[PDB]
Design a protein around this ligand. Structure first.
Ligand SMILES: O=C1N(Cc2ccc(CO)cc2)[C@H](Cc2ccccc2)[C@H](O)[C@@H](O)[C@@H](Cc2ccccc2)N1Cc1ccc(CO)cc1
Lengths: 99, 99
């Protein structure tokens, strides 16, 4: 749909059988989720943001449903304060920025 | 303009007589820019990111031109690694998210 930016653009996602809300985030290259239970194997990474770097786990080929749309991609799970959906999956759902 | 998200959504801004590039960042409530010289009054502030917190200076009523659109608002200046335009200015230029 179209979403204006007067409030945070949150969406519901379903991931790993669980329902969460996430922020649509054009500044983020990748998707980063708060720590959660996910099968099964993963690789450690660092990411940097404002504030500094964090260490995260990388899971590839995870299925996520963002609104009704399915996508498969990498997710990073880790100590984020907020679930962020970045450009790796925003492109899959066809999201654009328009002004 | 419409921007797809296959690459980072960067724009040119003019602020304070200087020309910069900045990310359009729907996840950011506010705008924060790397250290640069602005004239005038500011207040200290601290913002939290992935990774932690930074201390930043808040300047109010700063004119920015983003693409060919002028906006006025608060900018936070500080040690961010990248300049981000957040929703406080994104609403002023009429930016929407569309999927
Ligand atoms: O750290 C932030 N990252 C860091 C980040 C890095 C990597 C990924 C995955 O690849 C995801 C997020 C982004 C901005 C940024 C990108 C690259 C380098 C430096 C900064 C993000 O794009 C922005 O949306 C918020 C996301 C966010 C929002 C709330 C709480 C935590 C995280 N932030 C922090 C931020 C907070 C406040 C303001 C001003 O109000 C601006 C930014």
């Amino acid at each position: 749909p179209q979403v204006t930016l007067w409030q945070r653009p949150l969406v519901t996602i379903k991931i790993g059988g669980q329902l969460k809300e996430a922020l649509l985030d054009t500044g983020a290259d990748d998707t980063v989720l708060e720590e959660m239970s996910l099968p099964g194997r993963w690789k450690p990474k660092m990411i940097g943001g404002i504030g500094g770097f964090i260490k995260v786990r990388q899971y590839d080929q995870i299925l996520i449903e963002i609104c009704g749309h399915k996508a498969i991609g990498t997710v990073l799970v880790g100590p984020t304060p907020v679930n962020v959906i970045g450009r790796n999956l925003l492109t899959q759902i066809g999201c654009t920025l328009n002004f």
